[PDB]
């Protein structure tokens, strides 16, 4: 299990990230800007990146690609999803265009436009982790009631599985 069911420590974040990168090689570790390196995480493992994730339709195809990031939020002790998109012509999407790929349930509730905590501007979209610990805690206890166990390594895999509801057309990898 975890040190505190629902949240995640920096070491648990590395362990869960190392398993995500192994299971889904489209995700990789990164360091980011030098002046924004955190000391409680390995300099080589500051956050997870996956690039050129296809997005074929909104919420002939007009396909759009997305860079998605998973940073660690020491405030909530949970991961935090970040995403930035491009059109077919590799041009950066405006803010209002990225909201076409965010489901109507979360456009104004759980999505903000802030700077990536490890990268320079322009700002990016971010699913707010305000309620993440409460939901992951219910999931961990559910798989335990079901006779299984949600290990530390598969925390981000299950996290990515459920945040899909926020961006149901951005086809990032977390299985197979």
């Amino acid at each position: 299990k975890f040190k505190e069911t629902g949240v995640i420590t920096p070491e648990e974040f590395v362990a869960a990230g190392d398993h995500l990168v192994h299971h889904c090689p489209t995700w990789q570790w990164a360091t980011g800007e030098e002046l924004k390196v955190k000391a409680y995480l390995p300099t080589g493992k500051q956050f997870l990146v996956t690039k050129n994730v296809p997005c074929y339709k909104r919420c002939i195809l007009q396909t759009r690609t997305y860079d998605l990031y998973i940073t660690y939020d020491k405030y909530y002790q949970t991961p935090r999803l970040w995403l930035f998109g491009y059109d077919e012509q590799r041009q950066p999407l405006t803010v209002e265009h990225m909201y076409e790929d965010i489901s109507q349930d979360h456009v104004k509730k759980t999505v903000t436009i802030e700077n990536h905590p490890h990268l320079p501007p322009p700002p990016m979209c971010s699913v707010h982790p305000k309620r993440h610990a409460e939901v992951m805690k219910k999931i961990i206890e559910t798989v335990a009631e079901g006779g299984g166990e949600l290990g530390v390594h598969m925390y981000l895999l299950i996290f990515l599985k459920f945040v899909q509801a926020v961006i149901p057309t951005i086809e990032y990898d977390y299985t197979r």
């Binding site: 405030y75 104004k108 759980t110 903000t112 802030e114 971010s126 707010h128």
Partner: protein, 115 residues
Amino acid sequence: KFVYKEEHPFEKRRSEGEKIRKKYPDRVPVIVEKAPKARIGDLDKKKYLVPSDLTVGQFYFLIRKRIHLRAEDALFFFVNNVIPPTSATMGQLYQEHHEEDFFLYIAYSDESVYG
């Protein structure tokens, strides 16, 4: 969702706002209150009369100092559920979001989503 909108009726607020805007045209009356479920320090003062040429980013710094925060601690403003840009002036933010009582209302918290 502001305590000031309960302790003062709408007519008393509008009369003060109209008179304050008339007395001080280069200043705008602002009300600042903490989010109900925010875990940061409270403000000893909520009725502010700020200059129009003061930028929102500069008003961040004053409110930061009044609750004793550093540059690394989080602080966000919410005006009608919108985080204003720190480059806009308080006079521009007032012209766009001031209520019918001629007061600009701002809520602050340590979270990007006050809910």
